[PDB]
Amino acid sequence: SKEIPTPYMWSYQPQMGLAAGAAQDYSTRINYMSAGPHMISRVNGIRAHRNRILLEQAAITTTPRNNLNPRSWPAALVYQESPAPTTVVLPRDAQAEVQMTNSGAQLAGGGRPSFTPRQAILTLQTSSSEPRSGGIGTLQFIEEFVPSVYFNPFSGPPGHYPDQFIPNFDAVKDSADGYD
Amino acid sequence: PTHDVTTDRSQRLTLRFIPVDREDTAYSYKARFTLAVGDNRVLDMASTYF
Amino acid sequence: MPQWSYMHISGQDASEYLSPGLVQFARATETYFSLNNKFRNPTVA
């Protein structure tokens, strides 16, 4: 329980884009209250081999950060859409059609004109004006927030205890939220 | 002790719970409650009674 | 037996198998909010 704990699995909130709070993986537990030492020892080696994978998965995939579940992810640490620039082939020459029309020709329908060899091409930035920060998506909640294997739980001075497992806890208030 | 013992919010010391689905019989009586413990609260079930 | 130890028929007392923060919480608040009868201690002959 302290040596081989149950991992705290994180609850996502798709609206705020943050983790709600982590509770232990109670719903994937395996029942060896009817097993003996030939099989309790084999299941406890699977509880511990899983916890080695989750520490290995967090060392590969989770972003190194001080506060677990921060409230505003920076724009450099959030996956952002960076598309290719949009290449716009402009259909009509503007000042070559105000000279045909002033000369008396009625243009209708629609190089693309037979009376103009000129062709304008415009290249526009597709991405946003400012990079987005504040909340991670679903796919970055999968990469980060690997379930926390919390060895020897709640034994270190308080304040070092993980309060960001709790779904009521504001980090910048250091208090649990209420109904008002 | 002053701090971190008693809350500074409003909170009822005692709650009242109406049954959700009661069922009367000639030989017995069934009462189904919602024992709703609010957030930031603990309830010792020795303090609960009918 | 691993199931006597899981149900605390034999093994460590509540000062030892519980988390050390909960033991310090139940020791401080003992005079007004007792957590003592919530956890089972083994008595081994």
């Binding site: 308080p158 | 002790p1 | 007392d13 509540a14 020791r27 003992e30 005079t31 003592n36 201690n41």
Partner: peptide, 29 residues
């Protein structure tokens, strides 16, 4: 160490005992 939750007898917290956290009450043993 949750000693600000204990009533101060004097200048020190009146913490309980470690060995009082459990129970062993059982009929006949």
């Amino acid at each position: 160490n949750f000693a600000s939750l204990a009533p101060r007898h004097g200048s020190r917290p009146f913490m309980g005992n470690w060995q009082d956290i459990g129970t062993s009450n059982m009929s006949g043993g």
